[PDB]
Nucleic acid binder design. Sequence first.
RNA 1: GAUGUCAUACUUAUC
Lengths: 208, 100, 443, 870, 69, 212, 90
Amino acid sequence: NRFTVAELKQLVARPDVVEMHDVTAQDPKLLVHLKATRNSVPVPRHWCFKRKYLQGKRGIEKPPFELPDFIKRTGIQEMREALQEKEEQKTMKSKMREKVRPKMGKIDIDYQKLHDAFFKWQTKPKLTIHGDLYYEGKEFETRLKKPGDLSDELRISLGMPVGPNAHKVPPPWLIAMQRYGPPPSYPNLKIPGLNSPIPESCSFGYHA
Amino acid sequence: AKHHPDLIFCRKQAGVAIGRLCEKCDGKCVICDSYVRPCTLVRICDECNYGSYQGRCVICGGPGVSDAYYCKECTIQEKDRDGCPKIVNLGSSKTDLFYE
Amino acid sequence: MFLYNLTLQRATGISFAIHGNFSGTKQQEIVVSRGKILELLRPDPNTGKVHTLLTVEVFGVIRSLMAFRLTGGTKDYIVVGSDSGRIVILEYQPSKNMFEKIHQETFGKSGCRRIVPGQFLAVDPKGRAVMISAIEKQKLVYILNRDAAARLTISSPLEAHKANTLVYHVVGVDVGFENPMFACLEMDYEEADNDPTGEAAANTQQTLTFYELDLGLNHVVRKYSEPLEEHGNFLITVPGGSDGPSGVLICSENYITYKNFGDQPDIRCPIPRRRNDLDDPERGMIFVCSATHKTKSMFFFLAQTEQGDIFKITLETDEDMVTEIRLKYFDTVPVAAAMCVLKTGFLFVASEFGNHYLYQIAHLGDDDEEPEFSSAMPLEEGDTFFFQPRPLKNLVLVDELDSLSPILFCQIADLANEDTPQLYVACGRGPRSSLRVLRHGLE
Amino acid sequence: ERNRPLSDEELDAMFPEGYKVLNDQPSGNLPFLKPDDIQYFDKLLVDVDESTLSPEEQKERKIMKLLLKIKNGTPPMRKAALRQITDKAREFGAGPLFNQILPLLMSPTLEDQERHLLVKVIDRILYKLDDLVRPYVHKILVVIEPLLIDEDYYARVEGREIISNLAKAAGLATMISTMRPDIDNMDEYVRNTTARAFAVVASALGIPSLLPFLKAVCKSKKSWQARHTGIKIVQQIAILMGCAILPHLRSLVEIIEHGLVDEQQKVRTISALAIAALAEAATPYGIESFDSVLKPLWKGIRQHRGKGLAAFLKAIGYLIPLMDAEYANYYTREVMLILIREFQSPDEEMKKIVLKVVKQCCGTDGVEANYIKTEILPPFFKHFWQHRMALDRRNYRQLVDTTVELANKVGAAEIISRIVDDLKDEAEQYRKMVMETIEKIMGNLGAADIDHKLEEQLIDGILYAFQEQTTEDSVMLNGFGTVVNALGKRVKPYLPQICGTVLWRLNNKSAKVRQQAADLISRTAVVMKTCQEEKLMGHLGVVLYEYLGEEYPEVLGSILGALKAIVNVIGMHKMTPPIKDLLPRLTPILKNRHEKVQENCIDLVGRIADRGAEYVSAREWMRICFELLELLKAHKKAIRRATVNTFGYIAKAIGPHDVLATLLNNLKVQERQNRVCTTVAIAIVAETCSPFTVLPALMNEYRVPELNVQNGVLKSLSFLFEYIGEMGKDYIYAVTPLLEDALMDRDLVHRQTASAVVQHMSLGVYGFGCEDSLNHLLNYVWPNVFETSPHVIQAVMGALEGLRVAIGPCRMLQYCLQGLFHPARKVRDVYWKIYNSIYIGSQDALIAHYPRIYNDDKNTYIRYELDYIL
Amino acid sequence: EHLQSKYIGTGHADTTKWEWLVNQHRDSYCSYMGHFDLLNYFAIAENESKARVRFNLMEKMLQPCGPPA
Amino acid sequence: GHRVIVSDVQESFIWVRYKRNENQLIIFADDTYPRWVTTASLLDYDTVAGADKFGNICVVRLPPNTNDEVDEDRGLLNGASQKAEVIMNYHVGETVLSLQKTTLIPGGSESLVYTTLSGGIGILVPFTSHEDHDFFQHVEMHLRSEHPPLCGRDHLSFRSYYFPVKNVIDGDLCEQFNSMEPNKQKNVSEELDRTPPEVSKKLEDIRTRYAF
Amino acid sequence: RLPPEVNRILYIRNLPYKITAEEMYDIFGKYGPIRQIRVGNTPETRGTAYVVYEDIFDAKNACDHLSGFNVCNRYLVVLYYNANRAFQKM
RNA sequence: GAUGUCAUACUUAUC
């Protein structure tokens, strides 16, 4: 009755969306057609787990809150921290005496500054598409580079100052690239000093 | 209501009888149970308002005071186009407190 | 970016059309519904042209609209059902020049679904009830009453739903001072969907069910249900009471069947086709409109087939029963969605594809030299009724209202060497297609 | 137990220091068993000792042991026992559960709370034992039979719900087969209970489902008891279902017309009662279906006399408004003499039937007012206006309704001239009934027919009824207020005579007299402004400002209500008790632990903050805002709704900078109904004032490492978004990273609060071009749909219903795609529920958003109509 | 349970693909019969009028995908 | 110009880049919202306006990155990598069969003229400043609450039937202020702090500048 | 019919220190016979008292008629006796 | 990861 994964992969036009659990369902062809659709969203990976997607980050350290620039540019966070530091030092008698005769004017910063930060200084957040789902390890997987370009961290680790002059700004592996030739995995890669002009292509690489 | 999960509505054919609310639940919605931004009135059925049941509260069931109306979140989500939101049966709500 | 969409030219392709005294005077008025726009025209018999008096935007998809007159009144109210789940009964005010909504009865959700009522809307000839039926498994019946301040009031909608039963059409049978009856061609799809052999879908023809709303019990129940030998397409109610044979005739592919229950037999008559036209190898011909008319002497029906041959049918009946149904090819007309036969000899045909026509009836009846047929004629070997084509001789065209629907392609060009640009578009469907150039200037 | 006397040692041990005086235990931790209940729990005193001697029925003893936690145990222990009995109802079985529940509820030494707990346990075990209690249907029906005929309405409603659940679980054949020998029983009460249970089962399972069985039970001619039980069941079904037997009225009338013709008078009386119930249920209806029932009824009412003639007269009076005008005029002209001849009947039931028929006999045209005032109203005043009619409630309410109908038909002055003599009587019930009749005549008709020779006598009678009150009923004050509202400007030589009696009643030894005087002053507060009386109101306000020292809290709350009514009827800045000397005077009055007095003080504080905010020196409001946090957590549901409005008015008056810090500091209390009220007050302060000024501060409360404070801040943000609605389009980008970070937390309550905030932002900013933030919230809320908590599932369903209306049904169909044919059923059921919710929200929008499906071998699923192009 | 009996076309966890395809075809036929634009497009695509297209859409409502399996 | 906009009848319209040295045509831009568009019209070099057979009309806007240098297997979700976004969508009620951005009157501005199958003709004009667009949105929000339609359907639920509205101002609801009662027009003018002849002139000036 | 939170003993908070035993007996004995009354004589327990009645219904009627009673210039509150709340200082 | 007894905390403007 239930076919294997090989027949379900050979019968469907898109065998990349076929899984091992879809072969024992009530409709393998309908599931293969729905999973390989144009605008379909896949199922989350927490449907087959046993921690209910909330018991993984138990002992991991996390920041309390990430305030934006429009909220931190109003001076309310420092005043709230100062009020929390002043309120933590008061005893029970100082808290009971301030309830009958309170001291008005806690911070009293401004009235139009918050409206200017929420209306004129409004910044759009970093949104995402509807297909990019969320998981437990999505907040920690930030590793997801180009040939001919190097970052500042790799240049600081390797000790290669990036400059417009191509004398020392290419890495010292370019001598082997001049002795042996261009890399066979990238025929369109152009490096200055070998197949590109040195003062023109100051980016130490071009993919043309 | 949304607080008691065992409460069920009538979901019958709503006629022309407007729903009423008591003084303890005045202003609150029938489905969302909210008292902010009313948009449309509630339409009761023919069996829920007949004889002694006319002018009574749909949620509680006592004497009515004001008119019942739904909020904007029920009118925008097409929740007012359903049946009559009249609580007929009362299960595990305002029953054990009277005997204790 | 933020844009704004305005309407330069209004919609001209009318989807529904009705006639009646909406203003309240002795003259009649036509009400057209183009889906999203409702217009009112005055067929003035002095000049013969059509002049629009009011045009409103309903902001939706008007599925059905019907004018009905109350018992003992002069003004006729228009009941309209749209894609939303609310039927609106309104009345035209000649003073304010607007369509004031008298009542709005909500009985379903929005959207053009098969569970939301609004597709079929039938009204009684007396003006006591109104039936709103959906495509399948949903029906409601509202009772209109007259309050002593000359007020039109609506009661609670009754429950007349039947599960696993689709409805193709619905009409209201005439009943003089009696209970209103609604007749619908229902079709049960339970046995056709529960049997996987496929043979159950061939014996699932529609049946005419007439439900009589009981005013004493305040409920709606199915009074009669008679099966039919052919798939009915539309229904046409006949005036009765003190008039004559009250009933509801059913139209089908080369078929017209009078099926008045109780005592009258089902009288079937084939539709007279053309003489030697090569347009139907194996296909039939169904009706598209009814266009009932009564000049206080008898009753007639200006039926229109799929080709456009407008035929005036008259039912010659006995004092209590129906004897035979007679029909004859009256004239040739373009294909229209709904025809409106008004008073003083006027017929307005609103074509869904092309221009609309408004003609004057010059020779009504035409039972002098036309070879008319009858249902009691013993004719065999198919229909055996070959009518000859002829131009318009009984009616003469008076007004021609231009239109652009359907417009499949349009371009803005300045090939006329003018200052303001022009718009070249298309109109019509089939033989009535034409290329139309339009400019901002006046004629 | 709670009223047992204690010794001095037990009283001294329950008090702390610093005060100056001016075997019998079953298996350990089980609660105390009653000495009369040692029969059902007799197997619990010994040890279990499960070692090769433990059958399955001993596990049913555990079903008794949890019952020992259910009858007289702790309420957390009772909740745990109810959860263990509902979660294991299918594993334990309905057999031993019914065999252990049947002698427990049938004990002669039970109580009301134990019977309510047994009914709740039977109703809770009725959902998991479906299609399994069919042999145990009679054992539950014999225990649920006297519950419907009980005196309490809640127990009768619970018995009716249990009977409806049993009829829904056992079907229709088992209920007809079990109640079939229960119709010809010898006991009349058991037969009436079986008829009521059959009527409840017919109301819960449909009228044509039991219509041929009832017709066969009524048409069988073997004994009069079965026909009487069938007629009683038909009468109970007509009295229970009001407008539901209206399509089935002809089939009931055709069965009821066969009765009232035999030699038995009881069957004829039951048939007449069933006909009267069918006429009173569907009215005005059944005119053509009752044409064959009036001809034997008139003959039975004219040929014989007794209980059957009274039942026929009641049926004629119930069916007389259900006929035409000429038929009712012909019926009323031949039944008035029989009603006048039955006025001197010694029976109470016939007099009650005559009083019920007299209200329906004169309700339309045909009956003249002169004949009803000459030959109908003096015998109704001489035969029905007695002292014994005010004792019973059913004999007093029907008499008051008949008096109101006679005042509306004939005239209010002719009834007020005859009902004013009983207002100064020595009976409290008759005076209360006369005051209620006078209030009904003043509310329905009015006081325009009352002349000057009777208004002073009516005012004196109302003053004598109010001054001689012994109970705590508010009927006399409401009647005096209705009489004052009906008088209006005609009570102008009556205000000093009422003020001298109201001021004298405020100084007395009793405590209820001052509260009654304050309630009468509050009820007559609106009649002083319309009668050009400003000095008397200014004197009453200055008296009530000093009369706030009444030691009774019920009198102090009434004085506060009278002061609030005087401040509402007069100007706020033109009161001789001004706001400058009243708002500090009410600041220690707001710290009361009462229910009505604290609510009246909160309403007065809200009115003084909304109308008199410029009468303070901007210092007492900041001190009263700290006392507003202590006004919550009360079981009244009235002060918590006004304290948020008072805090919003204080934030709008003194600026939203001082109350927001107090609302943020009071959010960490770890108590129920104290964090949601502060969040609602903060949302009301953000909605009344500018929402931007409370925008970074609400972003600050999430910065503190606390779960309760973050949940309160999220609830406050969700309530502020729900109160804003269309104004939340500018505050969506500031709440989007907070909603993105709150949905990724491990706590499910914070995720549910973030889903509710996303649902509020979707329902408020729908149709504004903010679909990107809605999609970003839906992409994080989509893994939150697989939760096991019902509250989190309801929050995810609300977020999905908001995103389907905000982002469109196409995005909801794309998010729910490839989940309907999923292999895992736990996700497939949730996907099918989401698809059903999206189809119920928008069914026509799913046609254009439907995916393309290829054609199969035998069937075709490709849409060829939409694939073609011109 | 009751949601599938009250509102047809909702579905459950044990719903097959043929019944869902028949419900989608019935919803598409109801949307084509209700909206005038789809009926006008179907009448301009073929040579038949609006009444013949409505009769063809009403006659195809009974088993639009074929016999079940 | 050096690109192709292949409009598909079921999913959406996909953009493809054409190379000068080679002869391949690889698609690198698509849409995630199903529309089933029949006709299309190009307004700018990035955005493309299309219309569906259901009755709606949308405008697909390209992302600001626009990575077109793609030489050639998974994409984002069974498609391309650069998913486009929508910035405008409005339902008209009739299937729009033709659309063209041009100038119907000399001396005005550019506007999109659309011809549907119901005989109607629509004109979409962009907003010059934000204040006039905010005033038009306030007038539309006042007319949707003060002047309900006669069919009973909501004005906000009419354009948001299939696709939700985004920065689309319904001119038919704003142009009905001159055909209403004078008390309601005076209340709508006092709610917006203007005059009803001034509101009529502000409503007619955009219609006279954008079209006839 | 009575809630289980009510008891025979009732606690009073923020009481005047100048009140005598006769005034407390007259204020507590208005709703029924009072069995015992203990006033605080400590600086940490000043302003609080405990009144225990003989009948449970009389104690409930007294506790329902003492929350917010008019006294000298303090905000006295009447509440039900709790075993876990009275021993909070230990 | 589940079970069965106990404790703590949380949610639904519940009373």
